[PDB]
Design a protein around this nucleic acid. Structure first.
Lengths: 112, 252, 135, 77
RNA sequence: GAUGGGGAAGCUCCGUUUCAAAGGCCUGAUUUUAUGCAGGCCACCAUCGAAAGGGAAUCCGGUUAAGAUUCCGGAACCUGGAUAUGGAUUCUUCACGGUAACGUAACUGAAUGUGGAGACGUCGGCGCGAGCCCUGGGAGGAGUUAUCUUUUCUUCUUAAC
RNA sequence: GCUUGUGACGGCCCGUGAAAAUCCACAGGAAGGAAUAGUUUUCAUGCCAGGUCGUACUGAUAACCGCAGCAGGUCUCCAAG
RNA sequence: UCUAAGGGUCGGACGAUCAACUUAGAACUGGUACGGACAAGGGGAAUCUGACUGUCUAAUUAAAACAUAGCAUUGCGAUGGUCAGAAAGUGAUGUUGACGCAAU
């Protein structure tokens, strides 16, 4: 039965004027404006939430230690482990089959 | 009387196209040495809905021949094409669905989409959900190919004009009744201010030729000379005939 | 048939050393206590040698060809077995179950594998293995 | 802001430099069994954080008050 | 909505990357100098247009006749700029560990490229949080008490970081 | 339970439901780097600065618009038994 | 005023502990009253007419008028149809292309 007010001239229930309610040490109820929630950085070749990488709003990553926004593998943020595991394989297998794609057409060159 | 509705459209205003949500515009690659002489392989990264246009788009990306970077074009997607698909473009590209070949490089029978009207214009003909053009024959008396357009008409364009093998995707969208005004509302909402439509016959004379009253009716042939002046062209425009047919085929 | 051998070269396909070339040196096909699974004692590079042009100076070349090594226990499943093969003799010794635990021993090992590898790369006996594999 | 627990690393803080003042608070708290004992908090105002060290053993506490630099403005109570 | 332009007797109309020679970012040379220059990449590119859209960062207590997320007290955070000490790194020069998902107090990185966040509809049930609502014991204060009720009311709070 | 926030799902479309500033990251390896000594400010700590304009109050059966202290009109948030 | 049924948690077909209200039934009772105030559909048979939901004459007309989905006709392959402008290196449709745009 205690009621509250926005603490900033914006009187409309928009996304940036989200509000929380807090009991203060005064023993009094008060609004407190709440920032909008962050989202998980996503993996840039499958779109999945990057494991190990922190979840701040974008400018916050400039106030954060590097360990918070990478992991220790080829493609720290960027891509997603199963996607670098696929990635290496695909590299190796093709570069191999190149050599072959190559040698095999050099054989059928002599055959002519 | 008053400027009629159909004349007010020319002025843009309330009648321009609703385009905020549109993806980019849909085009072939710009025609380069790659495509003029060989082929160039892109992948289709995503395929995507475009507001106002049933028929989905393919966002397909290619390497840049003259600079180290990637280049994304926006194709119209062609039914069967699928993310992770390689897309080959140009004179030497092989006859698979999804590729883009010069008309002059495909056999008679081949069916294609998004075909250029002049080589290099980046795609003009057969672009809407479901459509395509058929190559009927070729004529190396100047590099020309003769085709069939979705409308019925045959047209002869340059064998250098490119098409993409296959039909435009988006099925038979029109096969489903719209059912309720609201569906048309949302329909035209992503297109343009053309809906609902008041009949001229329910307007007064100031507003339209149909206009006057005492009983609703047109009072003169609704069949207008092509040379009539704007203000007067409402109805059936240079109608070579009028009335119910049951027609069944076109021009062949 | 049964390849997993003494001097097989393979690509680490997971974790930190993901993407890098190595040679198995002690196969342990059976499960270890800690390590209850098919695994292999390997040694590959961690920082490859850099490229070398005619235009390169004296000690530049001497610098552009240092090689940071590494040694790992690694699950067979985190390996891309290759058709290529590299002789394991000079390090054969330094790399055993022993050298794991006690950092210094892992350390003295790397000291040796590095001398060996840098050696191998001069007068290019065995190449390929010295290039990055790019993805 | 911060709480400190290494009674030693505390002691470096008490000299440190930027640390002109500090304070000793005393609470009449009570343990899990519930017997009135003497908790004593050592607050140290550094430039940009307030490191408060909490000592529950009354013995070691009343000792440590005589281990602060004599050139630090300890506010008592 | 200016501009190279094109119409118009003209007030001006059209056009906005447009049929245009449309820039400026690093730093070497030079240490006559902080500076003209030698490198060089990248640029179909005015601007105005949101006090409800997007967006760097603050909270609680106290205070006035009238101001307060603005003053006071205390406790923070962001941005730009300076910088030194510590720590980390290296004779295997640009860190280790973990099979792996990944871990971390850090762990050089120009051009160029590429990816992500900014970033997005509506309805429904289901799960969870917060505040609120109801409520037992107890420590206080108020109320009623001809008669009854271990009773009725009420205080028991915790901010950003 | 109420109000709100939020998640993992599901229904809907011939509707599939902005943009730019801005911030980070990866790929790349130009280049700069130690042994009597250098590298490094995406780790901790420390120094400095943060301008201009608005900021009262009403917000409606009397502070706005309807000649007015007009039974009309005028956008929103909070919500007890 | 009673009866019965519908959960949770923890110890091995029971055993301990915590916690809700809701539902069906039965007896008793009254000046036969009880959704006791508040709240809250009258129903049926037909004819004319418009399919429906939607719309308009702000201040005398809300309707059977307008819309609509559905049906049909007409023009156009871009050197184009329809429309704009005094003129233009001018403009709408058009980020379009006949499963489209335009006109009835």
């Amino acid at each position: 039965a205690q009621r509250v007010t926005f603490r900033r001239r914006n009187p409309y229930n928009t996304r940036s004027n989200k509000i929380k309610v807090v009991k203060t040490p005064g023993g009094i109820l008060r609004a407190q404006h709440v920032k909008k929630l962050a989202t998980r950085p996503k993996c840039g070749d499958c779109g999945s939430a990057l494991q190990g990488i922190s979840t701040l709003r974008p400018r916050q990553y400039a106030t954060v230690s590097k360990t918070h926004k990478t992991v220790s593998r080829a493609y720290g943020g960027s891509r997603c482990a199963n996607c670098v595991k696929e990635r290496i394989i695909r590299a190796f297998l093709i570069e191999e089959q190149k050599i072959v794609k190559k040698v095999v057409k050099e054989q059928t060159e002599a055959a002519k | 009387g008053r400027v009629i509705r159909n004349q007010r459209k020319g002025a843009g205003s309330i009648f321009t196209s609703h385009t905020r949500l549109r993806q980019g515009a849909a085009k072939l690659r710009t025609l380069d040495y790659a495509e003029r002489h060989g082929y160039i392989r892109g992948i289709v990264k995503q395929i995507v809905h475009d507001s106002g246009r049933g028929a989905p788009l393919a966002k397909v990306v290619f390497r840049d021949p003259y600079k180290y970077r990637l280049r994304e074009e926006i194709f119209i997607a062609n039914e069967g094409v699928h993310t992770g698909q390689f897309i080959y473009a140009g004179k030497k590209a092989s006859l698979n669905v999804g590729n883009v070949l010069p008309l002059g490089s495909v056999p008679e029978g081949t069916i294609v989409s998004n075909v250029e009207e002049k080589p290099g214009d980046r795609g003009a003909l057969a672009r809407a959900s479901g459509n395509y053009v058929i190559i009927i024959g070729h004529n190396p008396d100047e590099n020309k190919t003769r085709v069939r357009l979705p409308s019925g008409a045959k047209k002869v364009i340059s064998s250098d004009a490119r098409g993409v093998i296959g039909v435009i995707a988006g099925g038979g969208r029109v096969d489903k009744p719209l059912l309720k005004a609201g569906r048309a509302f949302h329909k035209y909402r992503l297109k343009r201010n053309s809906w609902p439509k008041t009949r001229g016959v329910a307007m007064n004379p100031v507003d339209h030729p149909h206009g006057g009253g005492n009983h609703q009716h047109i009072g003169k042939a609704s069949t207008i000379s092509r040379g009539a002046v704007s203000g007067q062209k409402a109805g059936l425009i240079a109608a070579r005939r009028t009335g119910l047919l049951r027609g069944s085929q076109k021009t062949q | 048939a049964k390849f997993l051998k003494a001097g097989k070269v393979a690509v680490v396909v997971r974790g930190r050393y993901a993407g890098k070339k190595v040679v198995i040196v002690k196969p342990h096909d059976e499960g270890s206590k800690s390590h209850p699974f098919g695994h292999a004692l390997v040694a590959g590079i961690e920082r490859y040698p850099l490229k070398v042009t005619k235009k390169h100076g004296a000690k530049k070349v001497a610098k552009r060809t240092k090689i940071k090594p590494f040694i790992k226990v690694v699950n067979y499943n985190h390996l891309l077995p290759t058709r290529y093969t590299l002789d394991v003799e000079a390090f054969k010794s330094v790399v055993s179950t022993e050298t794991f635990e006690q950092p210094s021993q892992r350390e003295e090992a790397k000291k040796v594998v590095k001398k060996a590898f840098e050696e191998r790369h001069q007068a290019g006996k065995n190449q390929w293995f010295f290039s990055k594999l790019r993805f | 802001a911060r709480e400190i627990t290494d009674i030693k690393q505390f002691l470096e803080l008490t000299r440190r430099a930027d640390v002109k003042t500090a304070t000793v608070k005393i609470n009449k708290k009570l343990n899990k069994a519930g017997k009135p004992f003497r908790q004593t908090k050592f607050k140290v105002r550094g430039s940009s954080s307030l490191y408060t060290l909490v000592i529950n053993d009354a013995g070691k506490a009343k000792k440590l008050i005589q281990s602060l630099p004599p050139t630090l403005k300890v506010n008592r109570l």
